[PDB]
Amino acid sequence: AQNNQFIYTVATSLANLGTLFDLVKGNAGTGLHVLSATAANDFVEQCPSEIFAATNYDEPGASQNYMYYQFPGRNITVSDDTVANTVDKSRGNYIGVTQANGQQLAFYQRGILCGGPTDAVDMNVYANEIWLKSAIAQALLDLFLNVNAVPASSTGEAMVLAVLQPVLDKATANGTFTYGKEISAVQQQYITQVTGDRRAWRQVQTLGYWINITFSSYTNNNTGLIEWKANYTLIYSKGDAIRFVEGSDVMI
């Protein structure tokens, strides 16, 4: 219900996954992870907790796909193909194992959170949404501490947008946004009908975002005076990252 500002974690061992998934499927984004039923010398859920606190979100080169990491000092909770697939379809990040011409690798396989209807459904993407809300709220807080209240006519939108926009420049030159994308019929209609004009889906198709602030009048619990408040809508462009490669070596 908070939606914003948080990714939260659930520690459960194996064979609790079906019931836990049934209870918690959906509900924005939560990290369910398979615990090794043998021991607990790994803090398991610390896998999202660590990477999230190492991105630094100010130098170009953010986003990490949250899947192919190499966590050491951790226990292999899943080591069989059928076990790995049965853990999957019920979310679950199983920090498995494989082999490739020798060696053993490690991996923090899968970074789907739970989501499913419309949510970010990916720790990388949800992580970027978290820090976008963080940076934007901080910028607005500094704007308002600097000068209190914005003239809510057409210049208030100017200060709000002008303070928000360096955050968007950081986002573009951080890897969170995406230059390209091929917004199609469903996404075209959705972008058109949320708030944006007919020709806003073009901008997301070429730049990466569409941000606009309006102002709304609302009444609070005790304030008889009808207060006014800002409303910024910003269209995230998501961004894909490959996790599987398929080859077709011919003629031997």
């Binding site: 970010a120 209240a149 003239p151 809510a152 994308k181 207060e227 910024y232 269209i235 995230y236 998501k238």
Partner: protein, 183 residues
């Protein structure tokens, strides 16, 4: 909103210029009046300076500064418009052939112009909330007064620059809720 206070300040400055003009060159008394007199009243024999408003040209777009009242949480917007008004400053003083210390209406108008273009009067007028631009001509024209004689009615245009403030109300806001939607 400002024209009346400007008219009072112009009257004070013009009377000061007349007191100075009584020192260098001499006149029998003086009077300073607005030309378009709102009631029937005659012209005065004594050497006079007349003034009148001619145009009013705004300069630049209005500048809006927003000020919180802090009480009702209302932004009082202050629209300041820069303004150049134009004043037709003229003089009237009949010339007596018999007298020897002749001082024509041209002298009075020229002394008013030169007084109002001096730097000290500029700085004083600045301390009185406006300032004065250049006067590029003083036209001395002739006419027939009510006694069928010939008189000169010199006049020039003085540009005076100042500001007029407009106070209006606008609604404030101390929050921001967003929708981070994805594609």
């Amino acid at each position: 909103m400002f024209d009346g206070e400007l008219i009072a300040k112009m009257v004070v400055e013009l009377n000061a210029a007349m007191t100075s003009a009584q020192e260098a060159l001499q006149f029998p008394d003086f009077e300073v009046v607005q030309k378009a007199q709102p009631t029937q009243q005659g012209t005065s024999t004594r050497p006079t300076i007349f003034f009148q408003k001619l145009f009013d040209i705004p300069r630049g777009w209005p500048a809006t500064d927003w000020h919180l009242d802090n009480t009702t949480r209302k932004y009082v917007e202050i629209t300041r418009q820069h303004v150049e008004t134009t004043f037709q400053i003229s003089s009237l003083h009949w010339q007596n052939p018999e007298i020897t210390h002749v001082v024509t209406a041209s002298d009075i108008a020229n002394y008013v112009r030169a007084y109002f273009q001096a730097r000290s009067t500029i700085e004083r007028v600045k301390e009185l909330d406006f300032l004065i631009l250049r006067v590029s001509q003083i036209s001395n024209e002739a006419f027939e007064n009510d006694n069928h004689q010939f008189e000169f009615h010199p006049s020039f245009d003085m540009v005076v620059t100042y500001n007029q403030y407009i106070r209006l109300y606008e609604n404030a806001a101390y929050s921001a809720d967003g929708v981070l939607i994805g594609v």
